[PDB]
Design a protein around this ligand. Structure first.
Ligand SMILES: COCCOc1ccc2cc1OCC(=O)N(C)CCCN(C)Cc1c[nH]c3ncnc(c13)N2
Length: 330
């Protein structure tokens, strides 16, 4: 395009100085910083190099592009008309950067390592020819897993499920979207002053009581969508390890997706979104713990309705089917 830029292009000194690490994986470090008084999240991925990072080869640009494309398409839903949702993490910009890792980022990396501990290599070995993709996203808050003991009540749980269901439905309708890896580390929660959140599905607008939280979906490692019959997806048909996990219902969902799609990952099977929503519902009922339990009639009723959702939702064919037809959302 206009060639790689230096890190200073995306992260000028003041923005670098305000970086705090907030997350990691094999193929991405994520930092929070502040620009124009506003928090943002910065995801940085080393690309195109020959050598190992975090135990695996670096993605090429062509290998990571699908996930950037998916990010952008889902972000763009916030500005659409017939199918509109703000429930995917908003993408502000994408740059290809060249250079050694900024010493100021290493300081932030070290602080996270000392306090939370890292599975990753200390990123101090990259040379001045190293390419990276730097993605700036809106700040989404903290993941659901990390909020295990932090939510107010099962009313909050209902809002979260409703938000996720609406977002996935809008994406099914617009993009024939499947998330395919929507475990509780990929659902982000942040405070909102809005009492109700707004979405539009096939031209019909409606609202969701927020309970003070806004949900953002993240991580498109395994996601699938299409436009004009061009399908963007991660082909895991030859992956062995993804389907052999144990110890958590999460790992059954990979197997159940493979059963549903006959190991054909290019196809559209929006049932996979139902499977993830059931897994999240299961987490809400079994692993989340709330500050206020259902100590009244109205609250014991919400508990009952979420229990019924758990028992019935797998008989729906899509997030769209669930949103439009399930008694929980009436
Ligand atoms: C090619 O990229 C496609 C988009 O993928 C992502 C966008 C935004 C993300 C995470 C994304 O993928 C997963 C990933 O990179 N991790 C390091 C694991 C999760 C780290 N989170 C939870 C850190 C986090 C906390 N508050 C946030 N506010 C916004 N975005 C965040 C985070 N992460």
């Amino acid at each position: 395009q206009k060639g790689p830029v230096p890190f200073s292009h995306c992260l000028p000194t003041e923005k670098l100085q305000r970086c705090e690490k907030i997350g990691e994986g094999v193929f991405g470090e994520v930092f929070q910083t502040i620009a124009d008084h506003t928090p943002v999240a910065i995801k940085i991925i080393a690309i195109e190099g020959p050598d190992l990072v975090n135990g695996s080869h670096q993605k090429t640009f062509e290998e990571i592009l699908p996930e950037i494309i998916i990010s952008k398409e889902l972000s763009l839903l916030s500005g659409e008309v017939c199918n509109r949702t703000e429930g995917f993490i908003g993408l502000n910009s994408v740059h290809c950067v060249q250079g050694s890792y900024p010493p100021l980022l290493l300081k932030a990396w070290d602080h996270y390592n000392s306090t939370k501990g890292s599975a990753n290599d200390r990123p101090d070995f990259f040379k001045d020819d190293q390419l990276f993709i730097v993605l700036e996203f809106e700040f989404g808050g903290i993941d659901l897993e990390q909020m295990r003991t932090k939510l107010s009540s099962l009313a909050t749980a209902k809002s979260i499920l409703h938000q996720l269901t609406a977002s996935l439905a809008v994406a099914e309708a617009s993009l024939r979207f499947e998330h395919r890896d929507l475990h509780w580390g990929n659902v982000l929660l942040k405070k909102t002053s809005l009492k109700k959140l707004h979405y539009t599905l096939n031209g019909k607008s409606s609202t969701i009581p927020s309970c003070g939280l806004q949900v953002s979906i993240i991580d498109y490692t395994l996601s699938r969508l299409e436009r004009d019959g061009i399908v963007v997806f991660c082909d895991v048909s030859m992956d062995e390890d993804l389907f052999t996990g144990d110890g958590d219902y999460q790992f059954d969902i990979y197997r159940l997706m493979k059963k549903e799609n006959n190991n054909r990952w290019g196809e559209y099977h929006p049932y996979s979104n139902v499977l993830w929503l059931h897994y999240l519902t299961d987490k809400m009922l079994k692993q989340m713990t709330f500050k206020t339990k259902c100590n009244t009639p109205a609250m014991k009723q919400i508990k009952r309705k979420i229990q019924e959702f758990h028992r019935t939702m797998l008989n729906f064919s899509s997030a769209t089917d669930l949103l439009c037809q399930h008694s929980l959302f009436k």
